[PDB]
A paper describes a structure:
We determined the solution structure of a single straight protofilament of KpFtsZ by cryoEM, in which KpFtsZ was in the T conformation with GMPCPP bound. We prepared cryoEM specimen grids for the thin filaments with 0.5 mg ml–1 KpFtsZ supplemented with 1 mM GMPCPP. After refining the helical parameters, the reconstituted 3D map represented a single protofilament of KpFtsZ with a helical rise of 44.02 Å and a helical twist of 0.025°. Although the resolution of the final reconstructed 3D map reached 3.03 Å, the quality of the map was not enough to trace the main chain in some regions and to visualize many side chains, and the resolution estimated from the atomic model (dmodel) was limited to 3.5 Å. However, the map enabled us to identify the β-sheet in the C-terminal domain (CTD) and the H7 helix and to confirm that KpFtsZ adopted the T conformation. GMPCPP was present in the nucleotide-binding pocket where a clear density of γ-phosphate was observed, but the density was not clear enough to determine the accurate position and conformation of the GMPCPP. The density corresponding to the T7 loop, which contributes to GTP hydrolysis, was also not resolved well but bound a metal ion. The main chain carbonyls of Leu199, Arg202, Val208 and the side chain of Asn207 were coordinated to the metal ion, as is often seen in the T conformation crystal structures. KpFtsZ in the cryoEM structure of the single protofilament was, however, clearly distinct from the other three and adopted the T conformation (r.m.s.d. = 1.887 Å over 280 Cα atoms for the P21 dataset, 1.935 Å over 279 Cα atoms for the P212121 dataset, and 1.858 Å over 276 Cα atoms for the double-helical tube dataset). The KpFtsZ monomer in the single protofilament showed the typical feature of the T conformation: the central H7 helix shifted downwards, and the CTD rotated outwards to open the inhibitor-binding pocket. The T conformation protofilament in the single protofilament structure was stabilized by larger interface areas (1114 Å2) and lower free energy (ΔG = –17.8 kcal mol–1).
FtsZ is a tubulin homolog GTPase protein that is widely conserved in bacteria and plays a key role in a complex called divisome, which carries out cell division. FtsZ polymerizes into protofilaments to form the Z-ring that acts as a scaffold for accessory proteins during cell division. FtsZ treadmilling, a motion in which the protofilament polymerizes in one end (plus-end) and depolymerizes in the other end (minus-end), drives cell wall synthesis that constricts the Z-ring to form a septum of the cell. In order to aid high-resolution structure determination of the FtsZ protofilament, we developed a monobody (Mb) that binds to both KpFtsZ and EcFtsZ with high affinity.
Author numbering:
A (entry chain C), B (entry chain D), C (entry chain B), D (entry chain A): 11 to 316
Write the structure that this text describes.
Amino acid sequence: AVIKVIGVGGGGGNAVEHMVRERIEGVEFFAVNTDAQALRKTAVGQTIQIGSGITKGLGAGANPEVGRNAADEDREALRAALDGADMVFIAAGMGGGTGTGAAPVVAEVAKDLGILTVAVVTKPFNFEGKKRMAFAEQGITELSKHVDSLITIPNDKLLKVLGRGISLLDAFGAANDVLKGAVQGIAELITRPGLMNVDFADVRTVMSEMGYAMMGSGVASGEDRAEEAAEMAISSPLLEDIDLSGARGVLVNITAGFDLRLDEFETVGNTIRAFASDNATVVIGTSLDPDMNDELRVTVVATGIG
Amino acid sequence: AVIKVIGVGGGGGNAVEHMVRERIEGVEFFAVNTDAQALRKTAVGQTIQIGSGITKGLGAGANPEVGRNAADEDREALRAALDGADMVFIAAGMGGGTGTGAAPVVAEVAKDLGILTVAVVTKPFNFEGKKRMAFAEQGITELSKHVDSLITIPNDKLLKVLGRGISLLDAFGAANDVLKGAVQGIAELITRPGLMNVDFADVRTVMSEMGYAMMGSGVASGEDRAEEAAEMAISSPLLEDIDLSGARGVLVNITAGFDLRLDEFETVGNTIRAFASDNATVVIGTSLDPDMNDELRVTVVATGIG
Amino acid sequence: AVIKVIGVGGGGGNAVEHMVRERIEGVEFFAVNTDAQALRKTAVGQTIQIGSGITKGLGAGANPEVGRNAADEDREALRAALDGADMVFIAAGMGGGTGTGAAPVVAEVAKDLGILTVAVVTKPFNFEGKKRMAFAEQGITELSKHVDSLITIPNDKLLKVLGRGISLLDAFGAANDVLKGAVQGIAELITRPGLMNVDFADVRTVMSEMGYAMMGSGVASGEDRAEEAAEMAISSPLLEDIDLSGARGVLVNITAGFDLRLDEFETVGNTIRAFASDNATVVIGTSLDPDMNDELRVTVVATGIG
Amino acid sequence: AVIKVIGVGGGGGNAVEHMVRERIEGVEFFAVNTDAQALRKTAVGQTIQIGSGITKGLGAGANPEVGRNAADEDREALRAALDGADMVFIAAGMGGGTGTGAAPVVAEVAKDLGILTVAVVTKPFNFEGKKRMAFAEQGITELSKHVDSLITIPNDKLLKVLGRGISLLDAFGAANDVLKGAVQGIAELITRPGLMNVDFADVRTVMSEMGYAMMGSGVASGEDRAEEAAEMAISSPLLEDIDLSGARGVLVNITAGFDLRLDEFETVGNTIRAFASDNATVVIGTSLDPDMNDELRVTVVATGIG
Ligand SMILES: Nc1nc2c(ncn2[C@@H]2O[C@H](COP(=O)(O)CP(=O)(O)OP(=O)(O)O)[C@@H](O)[C@H]2O)c(=O)[nH]1
Ligand SMILES: Nc1nc2c(ncn2[C@@H]2O[C@H](COP(=O)(O)CP(=O)(O)OP(=O)(O)O)[C@@H](O)[C@H]2O)c(=O)[nH]1
Ligand SMILES: Nc1nc2c(ncn2[C@@H]2O[C@H](COP(=O)(O)CP(=O)(O)OP(=O)(O)O)[C@@H](O)[C@H]2O)c(=O)[nH]1
Ligand SMILES: Nc1nc2c(ncn2[C@@H]2O[C@H](COP(=O)(O)CP(=O)(O)OP(=O)(O)O)[C@@H](O)[C@H]2O)c(=O)[nH]1
Ligand SMILES: [K+]
Ligand SMILES: [K+]
Ligand SMILES: [K+]
Ligand SMILES: [K+]
């Protein structure tokens, strides 16, 4: 169908501008920011200024009540842009003023409109403050009762992965490729009418377990490309504690060429029910694309972290 | 006469699309799917969308009540396509949303219309979930009180047969030739007016014992082609436990050229009377086809597994 | 936006004389002096004479009540010039007549007009008098209850830094670059739309803690330019006791080219939360300027010295 | 501004005729004498005769009451010539008839007109008598209750300084240069608008401590030119007992070229506050003149000798 990504705040808009000018199929991007200076120079072709009568183009400050109230009084503006959609993604970095407050408001618009919403957040760095981590912890409660799926990319685990003195654009961009793989992973799943076919309906029942989520795409090629793709797709090194045990909903998609083997299918599916052996449901897909070469792809969604 | 195969669900349509573009004699195929994306690219010349007002062309999800209710409200649509027929086969992969629910509904249409129906199901893989096997076990009860003859091709026994790293298409396509052999075995029995002519009269009284069924066709050629055909046709490697002891209905068809020996018939009949020695009826047949070579064919139907 | 520096007294006018004829972007300068003899020859093209009916172009003497009452009666002139501004800096040298009295009055105009004001004072030399330091100590109370942020450049610590027999102009001119760095550092922070973006909103919430402040910009270039910039920006050698422990508000801006690294980022920020680990808020910024070379800049503002 | 020096008596006329025909900037001189014989031949272009109806142009004799009465009855003429001025200096040699009487009357005119007045006196020689020294002390007591600042050049200390058999004219011209240096130091204090700037206000509030005063200018050039100039400025060899301890008001002006060093200022101020460490106010100035050479000038005013 058609899908949308609403990235609120300046950091959420930073995820959007990378996605613009790529080859995009059936996806439109909306930028939300209380502060209008960040929306001045962006590659995204549409911009939304929220709280223009309450800030006149400025941010939310260190008090997120300014960012919460600015989005609250422009709830008329959020509903109009969210039309004709059935999957929205909330891109933000929690811990600040706007993204801590405005992102639940877009979720509140999303939940009021009967749409399936998934929020992607980044918990801040530890050195930037521990007192400000407290309301960032309470900001999770602000998002735990309004969003079906909590995607978290904590910044305290940013240095432990590729700690070779990478660029600040690169480690920020690594979290962006998590969300881009999340957006493109759902998009390639539903749009493609494979030999076996998963669409929106069994997508919807997976992350309705109301818990923490994790969704990324592992790509492998080789003789044992099935185990390398299954283990890469389940590995999310950019989280504090993934806590795969006690999950309540699993969604697996398999993509391979016409040389796809039952040994390849089982060994991807062999590692998925080891932690999902509890009283929980697992949805499995399969796709057979003839034009693309021997590269294999596995997309895994795991929601319901209890 | 004229026969029909109604394959519900996306996987059931995959069984149907295998049978298209072959040489077809007096057989029509109808494709049933709640999800309309799988019906977009199929070789079958006619498509039926069920639940179009309840899903807008989407699936049934992990809850099979959506698949059951979508088929229930289009019972007006199921009766119209099932007309002028006297043998329908229900092709589905059980354990999901639609095939768990919609296949009993097509059976309920079939039973209400006074037609002889046999349902072919595939119990899911063990790694895909054991909790979802529980309602798949209750899904057997959903089909045990609406279908005369239960055909099961469990996916847990897919590995033990030709486990040489076969393709996912090949392991799935093996079960489709089981149903194609089931359809073509009945059709070649009925359409041919051989030297001995089995027809509708003895066919109906065999599988009306209201139990599990098994329908395969063994082909052998050689000096002892009788025992190789009889033992292949009685062996169904794609089932959990065939349980041939305690059967209540046996239907046997023998096909050979004019060089047929009376010892060829007896030894095929000898291995069938061994396990059918209980208080049960056995129907046998004979065919004398002059044009075809020394290749011999044996079709055995065993319904009433108790 | 547009910002203003209000420099009262003759010495405060000397601070204004330094910044006139430089390349100025969005900043206007207003000169205040009760004594009109120092305003006779100034490089600034605009002047304000306060107390012309009470002194006729003369100073305030050793009694600052003359300097206080001269500004108090001409409060009509101070409000008219302070229009369309959102950030004013009070440049004065305390301990005299006018700057001891008139600078709180401009603050009183600033506080009445709903503007964010920071007052910058220089405590006098120790040899010029200790009795006159007593009301200069009491002049701190005169400014502690009217200005959000107290910037102090004491003259008793002037000799301990670059005590190589520097010029009187150079020892005085060092304190003017404290102001020029303070004014330009806030100016370059907001006027630039960086890749990450700070503006007035989180600026405003930092120094509203009603305490002593410190504002300097450390510039480093090299292999370990992160630690050299962070330690230079946190070091203010021109104060009595900086007292970083017990701060209530921190504002940090980071400027680098597109080769910016994580190992640059935390190592700047690691020295900031060592003393700001108490129950206080910390704001971090970041800018990515492509045109400029490998030189790196760090601007730190720390208000709320308790 | 514009300043005046009122010189009563023959010694005052000698001081005035010494200052006339020099290069004069903004200064006017008025010559007062009860005896017109000294006013017969003077280089000053304007003359005032007081007591012309009481003496017919003769002196006051050995009784100062005659000069006091003459000045009292020509107070009407005294008031008219003192107009438009803000600084007057009383030049007289005490111990005689006219100056001992007329100078307190000019002081009374100055105090009645709201002007800043400082009196310069010369206590007479010891060999001329001690009975007249008694009423010289009485005249000092008379002038102590009418003049803000008492400048004394006693003649008993005239021989102790440069005692190489100098002429009487040479010692008289030395005292005249003391008074001229006082007047001219005040002149280029108020007239010059230096980089730092002293004006009339702190001047007015310094010598209002109502005590003995001292006003001299020390000039030095060299490597340690600060200490030599400051010690020459503080040394007044032409007084009985300078009594720097217990002062109540200090006024210092510093003049140097653009090569002025901080250490010069430190050493000058350091040798000022040693005797000015009591509960007293110190006013410190600075000037930066670019055209003149490496010569340095220090002007020190110390009023309030207690
Ligand atoms: N990992 C990243 N986190 C970010 C980035 N940008 C912001 N953030 C996080 O977002 C938080 C601050 O965002 P704000 O709530 O202030 C949204 P704001 O309106 O201030 O954006 P702008 O004013 O447009 O810069 C803070 O905790 C940061 O850790 C980024 O590029 N990467
Ligand atoms: N052996 C096979 N089993 C299958 C195949 N396709 C599906 N299935 C089984 O069917 C079950 C899921 O089918 P569904 O009830 O969801 C019918 P659905 O409307 O979802 O089909 P589509 O949405 O058109 O793909 C699941 O338990 C699978 O094990 C197949 O090609 N081979
Ligand atoms: N560090 C510096 N302190 C100064 C400077 N100029 C003045 N001051 C300080 O300011 C105080 C005196 O300022 P005033 O109250 O007299 C203001 P005023 O009207 O007299 O200035 P002008 O009359 O124009 O010179 C005194 O304590 C000095 O220590 C300067 O150039 N540098
Ligand atoms: N140091 C100096 N003291 C003087 C000078 N002339 C006078 N005097 C002192 O002034 C005192 C006498 O001055 P008078 O009061 O008589 C003023 P008078 O009108 O009589 O001056 P003439 O009429 O010009 O003689 C006496 O004590 C002298 O010591 C002088 O040139 N230098
Ligand atoms: K799909
Ligand atoms: K037949
Ligand atoms: K900015
Ligand atoms: K001056």
